[PDB]
Structure formats: structure tokens, C-alpha cells
Amino acid sequence: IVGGESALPGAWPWQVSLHVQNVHVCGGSIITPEWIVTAAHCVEKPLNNPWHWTAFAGILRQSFMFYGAGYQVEKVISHPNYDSKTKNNDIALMKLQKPLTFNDLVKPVCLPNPGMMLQPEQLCWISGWGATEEKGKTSEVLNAAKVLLIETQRCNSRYVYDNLITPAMICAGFLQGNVDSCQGDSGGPLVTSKNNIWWLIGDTSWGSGCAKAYRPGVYGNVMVFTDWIYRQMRADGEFVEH
Amino acid sequence: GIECDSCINPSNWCDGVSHCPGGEDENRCVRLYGPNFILQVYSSQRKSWHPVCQDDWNENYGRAACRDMGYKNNFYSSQGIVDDSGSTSFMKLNTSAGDIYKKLYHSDACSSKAVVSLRCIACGVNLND
Ligand SMILES: *[C@@H]1O[C@H](CO)[C@@H](O)[C@H](O)[C@H]1NC(C)=O
Ligand SMILES: *C(=O)c1ccc(NC(=N)N)cc1
Ligand SMILES: [Ca+2]
């Protein structure tokens, strides 16, 4: 997160740090005690196998994510129509071996319902351990920042992303920059507060640089993916009934 | 016509019989609408989603609706509220029926004047308000 601030305990109880080889790779968002929403490009081969991934929840600091605090990932499911070249359908689901324990520091974010009626420039928040500046290293402390939704028409402009924003993507940030997600925030939450409920409206996907002018963050439109998300958990719920 | 994955007739979408090879026509028949979690069900005959009335709804019906949406045994709250979804047609419980989406029938009003608000999980809450 570039241009944001360090998160306090309980501020973003859904944010998880996904680890491979004892280091943070991507962010995720808890929706149920066993299901985390992340980005498909995080789990591209060779990280498509579940045994590579550990999820850390309720821990703000990377150096505090000790051996024994992590949750082993049991299943990884990339979106069936993911395109690694266009980042279209950049959504993936991770199932945990042991369900999370919910308290003030670990809680799920609500999946977006149809009829949200969000503002065209809705105030949003992005959190993650991503770089605090372009090409920087992972952030030790969890960071967060306010971003504004950017209408796809404007984001698809010729001086912004020139028709690269698909209906499976939403844009968030500031066309002047200085506040944006960055590498390491990918898969992390883009959430908004409405009706005193936090809604996961996007998952951090891609962008040209970090916090550069006229290059805002592009986020996977979770709203479009909810039908796929519901089908995956329901299908798992019936297999595991065995 | 509605597609399964890349085509059926919308009267055979959410009709209680699996017609798609992957069952896509019968697994996405229940949804929550709006920031107030209005419980809605898809009507095959009307090719539209409609709110569920609070009339004769209980916790166990919600847990069934929660299971059909993929939330398994997760259930948080279910109360009757005024319909803010601008809908004109609703779905009423049978009570003599014997599936949650096929246990409702079309109705142009609700006797309780309320629709089901269904929260399958306690989410969306941080340290602040
Ligand atoms: C409810 O289901 C029973 C079962 O046969 C049926 O006889 C009855 O007419 C149904 N009522 C409505 C209005 O759906
Ligand atoms: C993921 O690591 C990721 C997501 C998004 C960006 N770009 C911007 N938000 N500008 C970079 C990296
Ligand atoms: Ca059918």
C-alpha cells in the first residue's frame, strides 16, 4: 500500500497474509472460517498446488507470523476462465485444512449482494503488506488506505488503460496517484462500508506501476464472481459430506 | 435462453430438475439482495428474482437457504423487514409442501408486510462503527 497508514488490531479482520516458502506472496480475504478469496495470478503454476500455501490471520506484522501460527491451505481453485495475459477473471479461492476461529481480530468480510447501489466514486479501502513504494519490498506491518471507485468508462479512457478494463474488473484509486495498491497487495481486499457492513467489492489484481498518475489500481469485480464463488463452496460442502 | 458454461430455456432454469451437465441451472436459485440481505428466489415462469415473504418463515428455512447458497452450516440471523428492493411480486411459503426454492409460490403481497432478511454469516464488522 502506497500512501496509506499502518493498520490497528481488528481494523481489517478479514485480511490474511498468504505465504510460500516462509515469505508473504499475496493477500487474501476471509469469507467463511475455511474460505479465503484471493487472485488467480497469485496461484499460477507452480503455486497452483495447495501444499505450497499458508495463511496467517489476525497477525499484523510479517515478522510476527511464526512457525505454528499459520493455517495450511487444503485446496486452491483458480477461476475457470482466468486469462494470465489479460488478468480477466483474476479470482481464486483457498480452502483451509482447519477452519479459522473468529474473534475481534479474525472475522470474515461480507460477499457483495446484487443491488448494492454503490456510488460511482464510492469511498473504498485497500489493505495489504504490499510495497509502500514502487519496486519496494513487502511491508512488515499491515497497511491500509482510502481509495475512490473509478467508473470503468473513465478508467477505460485512452489516457488511462485504453479498453483494458473488462466487465470482470473495477478501477479504484486516484487519477493523480500517490495512493494505490502495489506488489504484495494482490489478492487483498478492496472493501467498502455500506449500511454499517463491510463488503468485499474487489480483489487486488493489477496496475501499471504503483501510485503513478493516470494508472489507478485494477481490481477483480467480486460482484461478477459471486455466482462462481457460491457454486464452489456449495460443491465442496457436498463432496465433504461424504 | 440461459447458458450453463461456455443453453437452456428459462422455464427449465431453477425448476427443480438438473438439466445442465454441471447443474448450473439448479445451484444458483437463492440469493441475498441489497445491503439489507433481502432473501430472493428465482421464478422460472417469470424469469426474475423475487423476495421471500416472512410469512411462516423460520430459522430452519433460512438454514436451508443458507445451505443452498454454499454457506453450509453457517447461519447468523433471519428477521422480517420491509422490502427495500422495489419488487412488486413475492414468493410465499406453502407449509404443505414436501427444494427451498420450490417450496415457495408466487404471491403479489405478504400477509406480514415483511420480506425475509437472511444473513448466513456474521461478517463485515471491524473495530469501528
Ligand atoms: C402446496 O403443495 C401441495 C402438495 O401437493 C399442493 O397440493 C398445494 O396445492 C400447494 N399449494 C400451493 C398454493 O402451492
Ligand atoms: C499485485 O501484487 C498487484 C496489484 C496491483 C498493482 N498495481 C496497482 N495497484 N497500481 C500491482 C501489483
Ligand atoms: Ca432445470
Numbering used by the authors:
A (entry chain C): 256 to 497
B (entry chain A): 117 to 122, 126 to 217, 220 to 250
Can you quote the paper on this entry?
Nafamostat and camostat, two clinically available drugs used to treat pancreatitis, displayed excellent inhibitory potency with IC50 values of 0.40 nM and 9.00 nM, respectively. The crystal structures of TMPRSS2 in complex with nafamostat, camostat, and UK-371804, were determined to 2.6 Å, 2.4 Å and 2.6 Å, respectively. Initially, they bind to TMPRSS2, forming the Michaelis complex. The ester group in their common guanidinobenzoyl moiety then reacts with the catalytic serine of TMPRSS2 to form the acyl-enzyme intermediate and cleave off the “leaving group”. The guanidinobenzoyl group stays covalently linked to the catalytic serine and disables the protease activity. Our structures of TMPRSS2 in complex with nafamostat and camostat both capture the post-reaction state, leaving the identical remnant moiety in the catalytic site of the SP domain. Apart from the ester bond formed with γO of the catalytic serine, the guanidyl head of the guanidinobenzoyl moiety forms a salt bridge with Asp435, and is further anchored by hydrogen bonds with Ser436 and Gly464 in the S1 pocket. The crystal structures of TMPRSS2 in complex with nafamostat or camostat in our study, and a previously reported structure of TMPRSS2 in complex with nafamostat, demonstrate a high degree of similarity, with the r.m.s.d values ranging from 0.296 to 0.445 Å for all Cα atoms of their SP domains (residues 256–492). The values are low because only the same remnant moiety of guanidinobenzoyl group occupies the active site of TMPRSS2 after the reaction, although the complete structures of nafamostat and camostat are different.
Host proteases, TMPRSS2 and CTSL/CTSB cleave the SARS-CoV-2 spike to play a crucial role in the two alternative pathways of viral entry and are characterized as promising pharmacological targets. The entry of SARS-CoV-2 depends on two distinctive pathways, cell surface entry and endosomal entry, where the transmembrane serine protease, TMPRSS2, and endosomal cysteine proteases cathepsin L/B (CTSL/CTSB) cleave the viral spike protein. The crystal structures of TMPRSS2 and CTSL/CTSB in complex with the potent inhibitors were determined to reveal their specific mode of interaction.
